[PDB]
Paper text:
Urease is a nickel (Ni) enzyme that is essential for the colonization of Helicobacter pylori in the human stomach. Here, we determined the cryo–electron microscopy structures of H. pylori UreFD/urease and Klebsiella pneumoniae UreD/urease complexes at 2.3- and 2.7-angstrom resolutions, respectively. Combining structural, mutagenesis, and biochemical studies, we show that the formation of the activation complex opens a 100-angstrom-long tunnel, where the Ni ion is delivered through UreFD to the active site of urease.
Similar to the quaternary structure of Klebsiella aerogenes urease, K. pneumoniae urease contains three catalytic units arranged in a C3 trimer that resembles a triangular disc-like structure. The binding sites of KpUreD and HpUreFD on urease are very similar and involve an area of the α domain flanked by the β and γ domains. The surface area buried by UreD on K. pneumoniae and H. pylori ureases were 2225 and 2384 Å2, respectively. The stretching motion of helix H3 brings Val332 of HpUreB to dock into a hydrophobic pocket of HpUreD formed by Met36, Phe39, Met49, and Leu51. This interaction is also conserved in the KpUreD/urease complex, where Val330 of KpUreC is interacting with Asn42, Phe45, Tyr55, and Leu57 of KpUreD.
Numbering used by the authors:
A (entry chain I), G (entry chain A), H (entry chain E): 1 to 100
B (entry chain D): 11 to 274
C (entry chain B), F (entry chain F): 1 to 103
D (entry chain C), E (entry chain K): 2 to 567
């Protein structure tokens, strides 16, 4: 495998997002770290699929609604940046106001 | 009891070359990875991590070639049959060829130490369009030091079947005591080639000249079989290599280049 | 497209060109196979192997480096030997020389 | 007053006559002796014995032990007793009853203000394991072995290089110095093995003066008789151990030639079990010589169904034989036979084999030396039953014999038995505290030179140390200067004379190796047997006194799947 | 004897005339020369050449190399050869045929007792990459870059502070000393860049005497002509490199004023590609001056569909422009055009751009310097085809040109080319061993100063090093004193004269920087082009010799998704 | 099969054998329970406890070590005392002796 | 739990294989690390089930086919070694040419 | 996310419990670490849901029965302590004899 440290960090993010999505499926209201992890992993999986950075920026704002997260969480997340390996290398995806 | 070893190989065509589809093994018989020195021929080496075969060991090798597959099966060293304590070693090789399949079963010689109670059974199942090019060489004793296989039991059985029909049944059975079949020749060699013609028979007879009158090649039902007895270990292997190099282009349409495991 | 694949032009590589060369016949009188490496001093091999050891003094196996030839018990193998190079001084093995081969 | 023996065992651990089963095995140890006085045991926590004026005396720091392990069940080659352990200045000060001599009858371990208490009630305290065949491929081994209960590692290597992947040789004074400097960062006692496959004595002398405590002769560097003779001569001159991994190619001769080249000089032979090689199975006969110390790597311990199937790829990767190269598989004929593998376990049981090494990350697992040793002990107990010289319905003798295979015998082999190896006065306080349910698998604490080096810690933010997730973490015994003060670096006598320690600025404490050249097979503890062992190269029928040696492969093993997540 | 060339390539790696494809790219390198003798190659493992009296000589430790990389495929700016590499005392001793001179024909690398063997058969050995634009935001970068194959990092910063987030400046002697002390804990050669945005020469002289090897002029601290002139004068006096990140606001003048302020003095200019800024696209013309050394950050390398879309937020975060503040987005007009981004790749191909830096964690990725350089090379090979001066059907010239961009040219720029930069005799043994299938992505080993620093290790408890999970771990070359002895800290001449090393107790070895003020565009290796480049500020039509320069964005890139998990 | 299980042979363990022994009656006059450990010098216990403290000088509770007996408020408990051993010097507690018990 | 460091490494491999199997379920073509992690975790789970080393060696070659992984990945994975805790202790499983 | 080290430790526990629950779904008998991880993660998820500490103590004894774990495991686990973030802060949940 030859996992680089960045890949280990991304694995940690993936585990956090697994926790977040299981809690979301349970019907809970996600807090700040759960929402951040869920949106970041959504962006990472979309990039692995092959979507463009602009498309992922547009799509990342419709993963979590205001009623799916705890009160005050949307204001604690002005934007989410995440590095993802698109078919054309590693790129930065910034999602502005991901929860609306 | 006995240390049971079993290997089952299934080959099939994939990506324009023969690949080892399945290698299911239990006990001390292993196949690591096929080699491709040529374009599509699958060169395979059967590993026997235990050096010799002690009394009571039971080896069972089975091979199945899919249609249109060309493979070259070899062992990376001779098979030693140590002196037995009373239990006999059973080596059972069963090889099946689909139509158009080509197989080159080229094992190393089996060296039987004095007092080695062993029993070998190699059978080939072929279709009408299958192609086979194999040999089986036995060294009875250790001729260089003087041992001449005074005692022990040997049973070398070789069979060929074409479309469920016994075409050749070669049996070499040695009882405890003196050996009359070998006639002071501890090197018993057999060569098989299923698609053969009279020109190939003449060429083989030409190649058997340095081995003397003890080498005989007969073509029956298209199958060319060469039986010989020798006592030098240098003329024998040279003749086997020469016959294989002569038959390779006429059977598989390939260069007679030797497998790299034979160390040139 | 195979990552990190080789494109080796066809041909042959001649090994140990321009060196003294010989042929010997080795008989393994032991009960187990003996493996001899390429650069081993062939005059100092296992005493079970029997051959003209005077002729093989200062010679090694003429095989590709890193390979080893195997002598099965009770066999007789004809092998190709190539002379040593450099200072032609051998140390180690059985310690039968422990110095220069000539003078 | 009087209480039920069950209540006493619950409160203070088993006393004399009680039997404790080792972790999910069939081995039942029995407390042979108790060094305490009933009703005067020292216990800590809340309103208990160890308090000001009750269990803690008024003596000064110089008159009391620095650390005390209370109510420990000491299992060691010298016996299985129940006693307290007093450690002073990082070394074992005393073994016996602890407490306050002012108000307690027979106190040999005075507890004072300067005393830190470790509660070992209902726990087994053993000496730190010693690993004498270690490939220094990665530093992460040092922690891993430390988790497994091994505190001293003797071996060579320079990292994941081709030479280290196959041999435990640290080649050259430069790499020896670099490895010695790097050893200061590892929380284990470390000894270095040089490269002995040289026919020029001066190079070996330079390597020994660089700081190695032993010379390693390996086939991959050439185990020719000349190299063996030169290395043995150098070791005799400089008093270092010689480890031999004899050539499996029979290139320079058979095993008889190698034994003749040894010439009756002390040598520590690896792979003596004949787990594949040209010298197998005859190399097993080498266990019958007084000067040969036979070791055995763990992967073939014990005999299991899966043992043979995994050997070929392990050997090919270890010896740099690429399966993708056609000429390489010519070496795949390792001549490994199940008869020798089955005989190795029985030879360990009889005491013919004195050591159980690891050969870490090169045909061997660093963290499964103790575990596989106890698995072999359990298998031999199951198959062969109780030993002939067992007293009572317990496995005390077998436990003592097997615990000596990785604690004291490796220490005697490499001449470090005066510092580590066993729980004795003056030894380095290298202790491992196990819970009996986890004995040999997962320690409750690893004390390294008087300080806790590694321990299972739970959540750091937790209000107590117990809550999940509990995993092993390095404690203050593995931090900078504290690690340097609580660990040893072994050097040859020439290295100590040359002042290697101050030239390299070795921050850790320095211990000098002595006694390597005089240890014989008789000097091994509980493993001094030199059987009249015969083996037939044709039938592989290993015999001692004309009796067959065999073992059936294990289908299920203790301490394997009940404890490990994966 | 004779063997097939395929068998020889399998056993020893490609020989002369064989072509090797770099990792999943379209670049085919060809072995130009072979420095060995056929049939006398040294190989390790089992019964092979490197053994006592066969490949390993009898010479002493002072007459043999400490380490030998065997059968390496050396790719470097001076050629693509097949040879062994001998390293002695942590430095490259020789390049050529290794073995035992006693029985081998032409040996220039004597293998002896003191020699450790690294098997590089079928592997590519390159010089450690050099990163001359590094923001020291976190120490975890040092490992990450080391995983990527970069061994030397030149840059500034004090941690995740506002100044470091934007500029590579270590402000003041106090922070310079603290960063120098912290550098001892990182397993990479480290050079420090001071803050040059000062109109008072005394502060710059104090910073240089503190220990920085160069001065950084950045817009965020004010890239006014007065500051540039003062920093250049100080550097001329004190022989240090000056790195310029010109102001993008046109506050004090246009690019012509900045060039006039430079006044023909040597300067290392970042962002010369014009990837956004007021000086773009005119700053690209700066690549035509002899005294300008043009660099380029990796994020705009190569031109891809996704390159532009990610630039705005990256720039705003890097330059501390909060999107939540209305007045901040007035700076969001970065004036970034796809024409200049497309032209930057072609300028790299033509050799107009000499360096490929990172600008780590501030508009740039630390671990993707080599990777993105080879991606650019692949894109230029795909689009522009073979170069004009290519000999044979290989990419050897292009490979040399692109490997000089991050190995030797950065070394010459910052005056450290006498110690690191390329695989040459006397250089520091900073080597990266790649498998050809993973070239430029994941090294098989990173040798730092003659010792393995970081390597892919599998399970520690495994019987061999290969089993999963395999991930990169720091080896003994990154442990305490071993790390200190196997790494370099670069200082200015004034710092060495002032005795900064002993005042701060710098445990690592000290190298003194020289030759910064004399390097010109011609001194760059394979990147000495000074084209008659013209650009129109209205049409953004970059032209050289009147010919249009353009590139098409890459939809899919090699070495991107085949290797990385996420 | 219980991992790490004990097999304790049945019987009793006699504690503090061959030591001077006494019996006392203690009344807790406080409003809260008082717990006294095994090795506490019983003559220097909480003054709320009322008994003949002259008889209890140099004695501790004759209970298994590490255990404590509890006196509830308004109760009357008969307890067994065992004499100290060793040097018979007591330091600490209320500091009422601070030295050897005899001479 | 008393997780030894080797158990933590195996947990990291398990997380990577979770990523790989989710991507495989999505219908993507796995790359080198994903394929290696998936095959290694298959072997480890089979060992935990109780299969033999030889059976796992045979079975590990039929987890991923050539069309389920990116081009060139099968040639980048000549073999996969993995340590797994069989009922009879820890053993090494080597799968040769796991993708065909 | 700003993951504190305790959150990383809890993520490791979550991964171990994922392994444990997958193996339980396969029908195997869990060992000591698997049982501990499964029960600890059950308690953590119950706390995240909003249950009280006493209710979680009651409910943690009915997650694994004696027939679902290997022989000797229930006696190897006298109790399980775990820290969990209830709506009223971090609290310690102790489950006594979790397997009966």
């Amino acid at each position: 495998m030859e996992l680089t440290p960045r890949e280990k960090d991304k694995l940690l993010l993936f585990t956090a997002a697994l926790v977040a999505e299981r809690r979301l499926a349970r019907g809970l209201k996600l807090n700040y770290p759960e929402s951040v992890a869920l949106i970041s992993a959504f962006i990472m999986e979309g990039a692995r699929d092959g979507k463009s950075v602009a498309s992922l920026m547009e799509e990342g704002r419709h993963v979590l609604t205001r009623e799916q997260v705890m009160e005050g969480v949307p204001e604690m997340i002005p934007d989410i940046q995440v590095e993802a390996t698109f078919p054309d290398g590693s790129k930065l995806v910034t999602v502005h106001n991901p929860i609306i | 009891k006995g240390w049971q070893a079993t290997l089952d190989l299934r080959f099939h065509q994939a990506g324009g070359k023969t690949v080892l589809a399945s290698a299911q093994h239990v006990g001390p018989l292993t196949v690591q990875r096929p080699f491709y020195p040529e374009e599509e021929t699958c060169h395979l080496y059967l590993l026997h991590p235990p050096g010799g075969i002690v009394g009571g060991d039971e080896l069972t090798i089975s091979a199945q070639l899919a249609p249109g597959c060309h493979t070259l099966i070899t062992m990376p060293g001779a098979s030693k049959f140590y002196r037995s304590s009373g239990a006999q070693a059973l080596v059972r090789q069963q090889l099946t060829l689909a139509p158009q399949a080509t197989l080159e079963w080229l094992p190393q010689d089996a060296i039987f130490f004095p007092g080695a109670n062993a029993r070998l059974f190699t059978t080939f199942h072929l279709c009408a369009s299958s192609r086979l090019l194999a040999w089986d060489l036995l060294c009875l004793g250790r001729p260089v030091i003087g041992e001449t296989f005074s005692h022990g039991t040997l049973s070398n059985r070789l069979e060929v079947w074409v479309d469920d029909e016994p075409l050749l049944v070669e049996r070499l059975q040695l009882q405890e005591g003196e050996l009359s079949s070998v006639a002071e020749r501890p090197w018993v060699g057999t060569l098989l080639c299923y698609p053969a013609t009279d020109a190939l028979l003449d060429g083989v007879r030409d190649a058997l000249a340095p081995l003397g009158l003890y080498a005989g090649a007969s073509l029956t039902d298209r199958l060319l079989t060469v039986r010989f007895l020798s006592d030098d270990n240098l003329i024998c292997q040279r003749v086997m290599r020469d016959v294989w190099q002569f038959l390779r282009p006429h059977l598989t349409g390939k260069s007679p280049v030797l497998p790299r495991i034979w160390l040139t | 497209m195979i990552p990190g694949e080789y494109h080796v032009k066809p041909g042959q590589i001649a090994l140990n060109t321009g060196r003294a060369t010989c042929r010997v016949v080795v008989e393994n009188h032991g009960d187990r196979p003996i493996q001899v490496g390429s650069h081993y001093h062939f005059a100092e091999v296992n005493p079970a192997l029997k051959f003209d050891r005077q002729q093989a003094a200062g010679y090694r196996l003429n095989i590709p480096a890193g390979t080893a030839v195997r002598f099965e018990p009770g066999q007789k193998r004809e092998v190709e030997l190539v002379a040593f190079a450099g200072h032609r001084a051998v140390f180690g093995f059985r310690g039968e020389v422990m110095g220069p081969l000539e003078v | 007053s009087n209480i039920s023996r069950q209540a006493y065992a619950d409160m203070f651990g088993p006393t004399v006559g009680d039997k404790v089963r080792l972790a999910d095995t069939e081995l039942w140890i029995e407390v042979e002796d108790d060094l305490t006085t009933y009703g005067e045991e020292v216990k800590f926590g809340g309103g208990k014995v160890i308090r000001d004026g009750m269990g803690q005396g008024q003596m000064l720091a110089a008159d009391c032990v620095d650390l005390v392990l209370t109510n420990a069940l000491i299992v060691d080659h010298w016996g299985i007793v129940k006693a307290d352990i007093g450690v002073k200045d990082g070394r074992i000060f005393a073994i016996g009853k602890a407490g306050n001599p002012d108000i307690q009858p027979n106190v040999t371990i005075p507890i004072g203000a300067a005393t830190e208490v470790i509660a070992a009630e209902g726990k087994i305290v053993t000496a730190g394991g010693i690993d004498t065949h270690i490939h220094w491929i990665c530093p992460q081994q040092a922690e891993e072995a430390l988790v497994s209960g091994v505190t001293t590692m003797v071996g060579g290597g320079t990292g994941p290089a081709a030479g280290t992947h196959a041999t435990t040789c640290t080649p050259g004074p430069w790499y020896i110095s670099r490895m010695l400097q790097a050893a200061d960062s590892l929380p284990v006692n470390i000894g270095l093995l040089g490269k002995g496959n040289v026919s020029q004595p001066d190079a070996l002398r330079e390597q020994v003066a660089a700081g190695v405590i032993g010379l390693k002769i390996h086939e991959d560097w050439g185990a020719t008789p000349a190299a063996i003779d030169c290395a043995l001569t150098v070791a005799d001159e400089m008093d270092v151990q010689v480890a031999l991994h004899s050539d499996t190619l029979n290139e320079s001769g058979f095993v008889e030639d190698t034994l003749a080249a040894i010439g009756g000089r002390t040598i520590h032979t690896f792979h003596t079990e004949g787990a594949g090689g040209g010298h197998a199975p005859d190399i097993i006969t080498a266990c019958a010589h007084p000067n040969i110390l036979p070791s055995s790597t763990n992967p073939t311990l014990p005999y299991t169904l899966n043992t043979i199937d995994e050997h070929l790829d392990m050997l090919m990767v270890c010896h740099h034989l690429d399966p993708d190269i056609a000429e390489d598989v010519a070496f795949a004929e390792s001549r490994i036979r199940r008869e020798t593998i089955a005989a190795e376990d029985v030879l360990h049981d009889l005491g013919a084999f004195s050591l159980t090494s690891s050969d870490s990350q090169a045909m061997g697992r660093v963290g499964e030396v103790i575990l596989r040793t106890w698995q072999v002990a359990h298998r031999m107990k199951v198959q062969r039953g109780a030993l002939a010289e067992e007293t009572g319905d317990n496995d005390n003798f077998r436990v003592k014999r097997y615990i000596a295979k990785y604690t004291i015998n490796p220490a005697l082999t490499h001449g470090i038995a005066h510092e580590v190896g066993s729980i004795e006065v003056g030894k380095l306080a290298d202790l491992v505290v196990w819970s009996p349910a986890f004995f040999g698998v997962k320690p409750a604490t690893v004390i390294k030179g008087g300080m806790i080096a590694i321990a299972p810690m739970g959540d750091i933010n937790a209000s107590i140390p117990t809550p999940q997730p509990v995993h092993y973490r390095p404690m203050f015994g593995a931090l900078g200067s504290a690690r340097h003060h609580c660990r040893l670096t072994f050097l040859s006598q020439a290295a100590a004379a040359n002042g290697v320690a101050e030239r390299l600025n070795l921050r850790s404490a320095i211990a000098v190796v002595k006694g390597c050249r005089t240890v014989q097979k008789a000097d091994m503890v509980h493993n001094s047997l030199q059987p009249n062992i015969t083996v037939d190269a044709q039938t592989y029928e290993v015999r001692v006194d004309g009796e067959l040696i065999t073992s059936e492969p294990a289908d299920v093993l203790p301490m394997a799947q009940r404890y490990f997540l994966f």
